[PDB]
Amino acid sequence: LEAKKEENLADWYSQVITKSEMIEYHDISGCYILRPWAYAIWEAIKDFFDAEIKKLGVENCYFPMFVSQSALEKEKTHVADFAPEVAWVTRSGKTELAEPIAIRPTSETVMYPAYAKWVQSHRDLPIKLNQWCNVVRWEFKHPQPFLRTREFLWQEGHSAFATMEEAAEEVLQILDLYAQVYEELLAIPVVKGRKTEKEKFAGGDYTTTIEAFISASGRAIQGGTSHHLGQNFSKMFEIVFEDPKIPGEKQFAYQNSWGLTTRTIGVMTMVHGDNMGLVLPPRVACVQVVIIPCGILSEEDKEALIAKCNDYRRRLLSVNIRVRADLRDNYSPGWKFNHWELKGVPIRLEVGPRDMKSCQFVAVRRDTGEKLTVAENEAETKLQAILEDIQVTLFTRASEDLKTHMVVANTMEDFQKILDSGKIVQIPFCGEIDCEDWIKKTTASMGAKSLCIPFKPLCELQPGAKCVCGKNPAKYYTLFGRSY
Amino acid sequence: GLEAKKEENLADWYSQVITKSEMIEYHDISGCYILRPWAYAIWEAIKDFFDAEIKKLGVENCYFPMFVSQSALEKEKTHVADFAPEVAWVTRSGKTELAEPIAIRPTSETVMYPAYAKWVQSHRDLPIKLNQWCNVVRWEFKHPQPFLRTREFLWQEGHSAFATMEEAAEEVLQILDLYAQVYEELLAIPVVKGRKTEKEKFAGGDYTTTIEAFISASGRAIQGGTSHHLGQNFSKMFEIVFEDPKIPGEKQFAYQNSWGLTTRTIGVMTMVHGDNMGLVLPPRVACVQVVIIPCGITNALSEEDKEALIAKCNDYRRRLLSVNIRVRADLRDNYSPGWKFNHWELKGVPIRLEVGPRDMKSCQFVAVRRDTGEKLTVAENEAETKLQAILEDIQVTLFTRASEDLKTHMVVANTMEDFQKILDSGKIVQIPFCGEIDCEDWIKKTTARMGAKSLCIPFKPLCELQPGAKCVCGKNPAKYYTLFGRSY
């Protein structure tokens, strides 16, 4: 690892994700290989999230990757937004197809004709389905691994309800689960909010979001999204049922969709990584503890040291810690030290002949670098205690970043200065698309975009507050900033 | 309730079963099918088992891109020649014609192996053992069939690379026995392990091992899972090379395997065990193993007694869930008990637990086996034990019947005429076979006078080949007993 995170963030990022063996490049730009070290993080996210949505009554399924042109076009605003980056298959071999078929950029238009078939009466609702799959958004802008890619893995849940109230309830439940993914699994603090009219999902009624801050770049990124689609799709796909109270009155289902992608891993890298490499929160780390023999002497001594390393390995497995003993004669201890530091293993467990003589070992925390000498007696307990402290510590520092870099401004001048110091800003906002474009133009390296209207803003909007445009009154404190 | 009869028109019976059990929904693009939760849960049960098993072997999961460039796709000419006609090509994004067309993986050898070549620079970088759970596209213009032959399907594909032949050889057979376990232990489907003939092997591989299942209603066999030894054919083309100090200066090529299993599994499960009442789920993979159905009422039933029966149903739900049996209590007040009986029989739930008032105060219940229809009266106390005992017995029973089918419909013939007779009986035949591609073509066309295809060369044939035995063609000596039959 040669580039420094605070001097060239992009070269740093590329080096960190490849040398930690998370990502490999592919010969088709914007598509990245998820090697096991990254894929394991995705599997930990999947385990937690899939269990949580099962408790809500969501079931997993799998819908086709291809959508017909006429299904794709049924919801005019949705298709208008996605059509420029929809990839089209036009032949198999050299045989042109009867009609071009599209790869899903998102599955609303694949799933909802089926929903219309399945909703025959109000008894058939709710429908609550989720799929873990890949989607393709073939934009020609520059990709960035994890954060903005042409193919990505995600989960997308689609729910249909007989009542708007039940749908509005699920929207926030799912958003709170996304916040838990970031804050409890990834140790990343996020801000819950709603998108402005300009930024909301096309075809939806409103979009709720969690926003994460990457202080290295002073930029925010959306981490997960939970939309209320209302009746905009059900009226176009005829997901209908007869009103139970009133004979012959047809009603349209109320729908939500919600998504979360492997962008998570990238945010995790950008927030916690350092100049020694990846830093893994213990909750998602493939390997939580790596055991490494040091020193290295008698044949009996070397055999006894390896035996002690495996005593530690087994007693850690005894209490469900994910542990690897790296007992390779190939590489020196210092080499392995920096290799596993590069991969972000929370704890390095060092066992040398002297410490083993003294019935103790050394535990080295990846986040702070602190070396603790621990009696062998404590091993499982202490290490668990340390892993929890690492998780909290990561969260705490990132929270202090967010608190430091998210502030209120009530004037465009204050706004601009704070923005150019590398922070995100909550300003009073009129909500109009034209004024949002004006903000993006006059704050331009990029202009600031709206990130979200926070559920809980830093300050109370005072009666009669003007927007920063000055022309119209303010409707809400809105978090603005530069965005990935 | 089912209309079509399995023994009358298998195809319409199959479509009826897969839709009315809520496994499959049709899509407006032909050859692609929606896997509804009922089917997807079977796939996830197979996934749980197989993923744990290959983790014990050292395989790690990952995810490679869906797209492959033309350059990569052509590098192993046999493989690309075999797949080219059914590779789907993306040619534009929106209305922007792409500079270069890009292909969707029909299989990921040509996606993964350039990366493997980058990662292997020494013998210590081997072995590489990766697996992905993903979707692939084979866009063939023939008639698709849900689960069995589809244009897009879910699968797992594992790709491993080794410094030596011996370890690769070992993995081929290990994975094959895992597939045999998926079929025989999870899905209660008996299979025959064997090696594909030269004509039927994976193009560009060295040899292909296979498990074949028999569908007696059709009299046809089908490949259930596959495990290839690729040898060095792909590593020489993608330069997956390494140097070892044991052999100075010689760049050695990795020995590779790839192995795949798809949602075809579920189709075979349907074709083998389904009956004229609908699906039949082996308890090992059943989303719901026991459905509890209050069948003590109509809308005229008392408000108090309704509450009592619903509470007893929830009692059974809690007990069964407490000993991890997968249970649904269907307490929907809006459907009648007979509607629920039919619904869950259609979906193949192994045990129906009926709770009525008279039995509810004789402290008993009724258990109805989906495979045999037998009704049993059970004391309340035996609930969690009894029902487990029945589930086990259903699994065994399904497997036993299936094996008695296979044992009855797989026989030996030694000349072409017995072979033709037996084959038209709706059976599959082990014959002495020379192994040659021309002769396998001849067998296919003469037997159409569709024709029989080779299914596999059994590891364990029914009989031992005589010394000097000649093939059923007569022109060359037989080299092995080979399982032939009409095939899906």
Ligand SMILES: COc1cncc(-c2cc(F)cc(CNC(=O)c3cc(N4CC[C@@](C#N)(C5CC5)C4=O)cc(C)n3)c2)c1
């Ligand atoms: C908008 O200006 C850009 C600037 N710089 C680069 C690009 C760009 C370049 C590419 F080569 C390819 C693409 C296409 N991929 C994506 O747009 C994208 C979106 C998301 N998203 C969007 C919001 C969401 C959340 N939460 C939703 C749940 C889904 C979430 O995760 C995640 C990923 C991995 N990729 C964009 C575009």
Ligand SMILES: COc1cncc(-c2cc(F)cc(CNC(=O)c3cc(N4CC[C@@](C#N)(C5CC5)C4=O)cc(C)n3)c2)c1
């Ligand atoms: C061969 O003449 C035909 C006759 N009638 C119809 C077709 C046809 C029609 C289509 F519309 C689409 C397709 C393409 N899909 C498939 O070829 C296919 C193969 C497999 N395979 C192949 C063997 C394997 C095993 N074990 C390998 C692990 C992979 C396994 O599961 C599984 C599935 C679900 N689909 C074929 C073709």
Ligand code: PRO
């Ligand atoms: O693309 C999106 O944002 C929504 C959420 C998942 C499904 N569609």
Ligand code: PRO
């Ligand atoms: O398609 C096949 O048959 C092999 C096995 C999975 C990957 N390639």
Ligand SMILES: [Ca+2]
């Ligand atoms: Ca767009």
Ligand SMILES: [Ca+2]
């Ligand atoms: Ca109306």
Ligand SMILES: [Ca+2]
């Ligand atoms: Ca001591």
Ligand SMILES: [Ca+2]
């Ligand atoms: Ca072919």
Ligand SMILES: [Cl-]
């Ligand atoms: Cl077509």
Ligand SMILES: [Cl-]
């Ligand atoms: Cl609108």
Ligand SMILES: [Cl-]
């Ligand atoms: Cl909040």
Ligand SMILES: [Zn+2]
């Ligand atoms: Zn304004």
Ligand SMILES: [Zn+2]
């Ligand atoms: Zn012959």
